[PDB]
Design a binder for these strands. Structure first.
Lengths: 94, 95
DNA sequence: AATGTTTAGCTAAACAAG
DNA sequence: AATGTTTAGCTAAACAAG
């Protein structure tokens, strides 16, 4: 169970193109710790829809909290360079 | 954007794709038909037909990269992101 | 007018976790 | 059994270009 403080939630949704329903679901789950099931029930949504709603806000938070100084990069690379990049990632993981 | 039937089959190889999307994508990319023809015939929105074409085109773009090349995404220290950006230019210059 | 695009958001239903 | 995740495929409706 991923959780956010209100401060972290405010950061997550600042500038985010997100509707009121998604905000309410995400706050209830991530900030208040309520089950996603409660919103699926009350809003007449599939479990997958509620899962995606929480994920949209979580993903936004993650994008604003990358390690200090780090950049996301995407590139088409030859085999040996692609290997090096994946190994930088793998070694950073563990 | 246009494809031969061979390129089209390459595009969809290993792709999870249903026949309706295959029909739309072939019609547009291979046979050169407007997307509009499929929105009408299949009762779909324009955006659905546009996405259908996109799903197969994107798959083709990945298959059609040079042998041994791959699209990688990573979150890295700035200096390593810099190295990757340079490599990306080196690869473009070679191709 | 006509045609094609973008993306937040949702479905279906298999799947993964609890 | 209940609950949460994934993703090709869909719409909505606003935007892009002619």
């Amino acid at each position: 169970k991923k959780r956010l403080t209100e401060s972290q939630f405010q950061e997550a949704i600042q500038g985010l193109e997100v509707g009121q329903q998604t905000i309410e679901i995400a706050r209830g789950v991530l900030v208040d710790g309520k089950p996603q099931a409660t919103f699926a029930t009350s809003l007449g949504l599939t479990r997958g829809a509620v899962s995606q709603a929480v994920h949209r806000v979580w993903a936004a938070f993650e994008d604003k909290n990358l390690p200090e100084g780090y950049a996301r990069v995407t590139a088409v690379l030859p085999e040996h360079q692609a290997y090096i990049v994946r190994k930088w990632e793998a070694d950073a993981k563990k």
